[PDB]
Structure 1
């Protein structure tokens, strides 16, 4: 996209016979592989490593089951300079209230006297402010900060795509001083339990019906998401990858 790039790859076991309808929907992102060969996982991991500029590596941290029938992966990568970078000179140690009476040191970036898109939002599930920090190009970071020192959970659990658009649309340019942490975080998530709790009860394991993939039984037992973000004075860099197999 210029700041954001994405790819998907699908790997099917060479000994299975695939259905052309499925293959057509997947496009030219498909290849067959031998899951009994150890360098197979090495080559998939290297692909994702290179695409994510080293930030997701390895995606697959377990040897693959030699009985795998299909592995589906996605990877995404983002890096952009702030439109207005923070001055390191202003970065300094601040208390972060992880809870209202527990303070943990953070490196806080600060920018004074500039104008940003901003709104003050009043809701039944909590009052908050929202600001937009633009990147060079056509992306931005939008930050949602509760007015009450431990007010996030009720706002979080009312965050929907529609709400978010509504609040973002209400922002207008205002002079405001901004203080936000510099941070790096890596995540790794087992998506099966969350998706089951959301209603995907016949997707993972034996109840999953993927009979439209091939002439053989395909099961999907696991789904992992691995992520990386670095927020600093000059840029944000972010990457993620997802695997179902």
Structure 2
């Protein structure tokens, strides 16, 4: 159906994974790419068969086949240079060297998920790590570069390695002025307060706020990018005595939409921490919970459409690394001109000085490129 309803399914899966990781590590900084996860599951599903494919299909809610076109268009639009803001995305599946990979698998992967699939001698740990870590460094413009160590990918007991990497740092439609970037108090999870640099700007932003199923209230602001297609969403508890963990679990794409229909424009002093978030995620355990356990089983895993022979192929390592930087850089002063003047009278504040979660959203598709929680900038 609608390429929007489809992207909804993918993003949802990624969010559910986010909720899992978050509950296990409440006070840590977690950055994930919900949509990225949907692409990884797709990459996998393309060369999987039997029980394995069955599991992936029932979680994704859609089958790669007959949809690829829809998936390729969305995955193409996201990175499309038409966004003005560039979203670097790397996708690779590495296979044992002593195994002949199939042509249609490689062809389709690069076509739908812009994914590079190729062999690599895991027999030599150090040689493989460098070979892989180097591909990420290149595919991400030196943005990301350290997914595997030497103590991780070891021996021939390692057969299949999946990797998804996402980096982003567009240009604000309303750039912050460095002169206005000073250090302000931030209250961490533990309760301790830290002095942290924060971006500050006076302008019109879309705001709003509602209560969770548990009747706890939170606020949310939209910070659009100069591209006009990708925007950043920020939501945090209204009451300081409210833990972020009390709103997270109640947030799906469905709620993200409400946000869009509820928010109204208002002149505000938006103050948010200036930071650079980078996290690496092991998707194995979370994905098992969803019901995908086969592919992680040396024997039960069924990847026939991946290999020319009947060699046993399973997922040894499935990883994602997401990196995002929030800074002043953005478009400049044209509406900033007199807009600075009409502020005849101090405006309300949107101060993000407590643990908060953020979203990078590709509006046209609905794709949720980033989902994160910042417990300590």
Q: TM-score range by the shorter chain?
A: 0.7 to 0.9
Task: Check the 8 A contact 2:162/2:318 in 1, yes or no.
Answer: no
Task: Check the 8 A contact 1:51/1:77 in 2, yes or no.
Answer: no
**Would you tell me which structure has more strand in proportion to its own residues?**
1
Verify: 1:5 aligned to 2:88, yes or no.
Answer: yes
Q: CA deviation at 1:129?
A: 1.4
Pairwise CA RMSD of aligned residues? 2.7
| Compared CA separation, residues 55 and 5, structure 1 to 2 (3 A) | closer
The one of 152, 159, 163 equivalent to 1:73 is 163
Aligned to 2:120: 33
| Compared CA separation, residues 86 and 130, structure 1 to 2 (3 A) | same
Verify: 1:217 aligned to 2:312, yes or no.
Answer: yes
Distance 1:100 1:129 in 2: 21
Distance 1:70 1:103 in 2: 44
**Would you tell me which structure has more helix in proportion to its own residues?**
2
Verify: 1:49 aligned to 2:118, yes or no.
Answer: no
The CA deviation string for residues 51-99 of structure 1, in whole angstroms up to 9 with x for no partner, is 2232311222236334233333333332311111112222222221114
Extract unaligned runs of 5+ from structure 2. 1-78, 331-359, 361-368, 371-377
Verify: 1:173 aligned to 2:261, yes or no.
Answer: no
Extract unaligned runs of 5+ from structure 1. 241-245
Deviates more, 1:130-139 or 1:72-81: 72-81
Aligned to 2:334: none
Verify: 1:136 aligned to 2:226, yes or no.
Answer: yes
Task: Check the 8 A contact 1:5/1:77 in 2, yes or no.
Answer: yes
The one of 206, 212, 215 equivalent to 1:117 is 206
Q: CA deviation at 1:202?
A: 2.6
Distance 1:27 1:231 in 2: 30
| Compared CA separation, residues 198 and 59, structure 1 to 2 (3 A) | same
The CA deviation string for residues 135-182 of structure 1, in whole angstroms up to 9 with x for no partner, is 111211111121111342121011112111221232221112111001
Structure 2 counterpart SS, 1:80 = coil
Distance 1:226 1:49 in 2: 12
Aligned to 2:255: 163
- The alignment's TM-score, normalised by the length of structure 1, stands at 0.83
Q: CA deviation at 1:39?
A: 3.5
The number of aligned residues is: 237
- The alignment's TM-score, normalised by the length of structure 2, stands at 0.56
Task: Check the 8 A contact 2:213/2:250 in 1, yes or no.
Answer: no
Matches of residues 101-112 of structure 1 in structure 2 within 5 Å?
Answer: 101-112=191-202
Structure 2 counterpart SS, 1:48 = helix
Distance 1:36 1:62 in 2: 11
The CA deviation string for residues 175-199 of structure 1, in whole angstroms up to 9 with x for no partner, is 1211100112322222222222333
Aligned to 2:147: 59
The CA deviation string for residues 188-213 of structure 1, in whole angstroms up to 9 with x for no partner, is 22222222233323332334332342
